[PDB]
Design a protein around this ligand. Structure first.
Ligand SMILES: O=c1[nH]cnc2c1ncn2[C@@H]1O[C@H](COP(=O)(O)O)[C@@H](O)[C@H]1O
Ligand SMILES: [Cl-]
Length: 207
């Protein structure tokens, strides 16, 4: 029956070539209408699908279920291995969902853990998923707590991470130009990595 339901999701979703709202809405409905211990089993089974759109659905479920530390660890360490970039985009959204549910201030230790993780996809999920960082609670009132955390990744080894880092600072610069200017002025523009991030972050700054 659970297997039958995964088979129905595969039929429903496998031909979708763009977007994520259909998978998201189905996950939200299923999360709200069933007990969490059952939905955890469904999420793990769906995440094993060879249909990446069903894995997207499963990762939305993980986000809704992420108060359970075992689900959050599976997101951090296993979903981050997914070879499909659309699933990676859903991982970022599911991480934002975790932070929204617990509260952004209460989530800071987990944010910091993901930003320091060994898997570049874990680091990127946190940097990208919270964009625009200063539109979220806590960061909106404390913008330097976002700027400092993002700027710490300006030397990241991964280009995928660095693009998210630079664009996350670019977002913030449009509403907090004074604070981003102060941060950028302190950078020593030596490495290839930091120069890539600096160019993205500085477009709207009168340096
Ligand atoms: O790794 C990627 N490969 C291809 N497109 C990507 C990738 N990462 C982000 N995108 C882009 O993200 C966007 C997703 O929009 P969608 O196709 O309407 O769902 C597309 O422009 C994609 O080209
Ligand atoms: Cl936003």
């Amino acid at each position: 029956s659970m297997k039958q339901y995964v088979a129905r999701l595969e039929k429903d979703f496998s031909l979708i070539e763009h977007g994520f709202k259909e998978e998201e809405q189905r996950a939200l409905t299923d999360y709200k209408s069933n007990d969490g211990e059952y939905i955890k089993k469904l999420a793990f089974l769906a995440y094993q699908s060879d249909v990446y759109q069903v894995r997207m659905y499963a990762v939305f479920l993980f986000g809704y279920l992420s108060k359970d530390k075992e689900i959050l660890i599976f997101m951090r360490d296993e979903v981050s291995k997914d070879n499909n970039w659309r699933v990676q985009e859903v991982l970022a959204k599911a991480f934002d969902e975790f932070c929204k549910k617990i509260g952004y201030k209460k989530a800071l230790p987990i944010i910091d853990e993901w930003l320091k993780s060994s898997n570049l996809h874990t680091r990127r999920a946190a940097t990208e998923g919270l964009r625009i960082w200063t539109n979220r609670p806590y960061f909106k009132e404390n913008p330097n707590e976002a700027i400092r955390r993002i700027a710490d990744l300006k030397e990241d080894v991964s280009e995928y991470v660095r693009k998210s880092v630079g664009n996350a600072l670019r977002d913030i610069s449009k509403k907090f130009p004074d604070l981003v200017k102060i941060e950028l002025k302190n950078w020593k523009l030596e490495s290839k990595e930091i120069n890539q991030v600096y160019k993205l972050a500085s477009k709207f700054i009168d340096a």
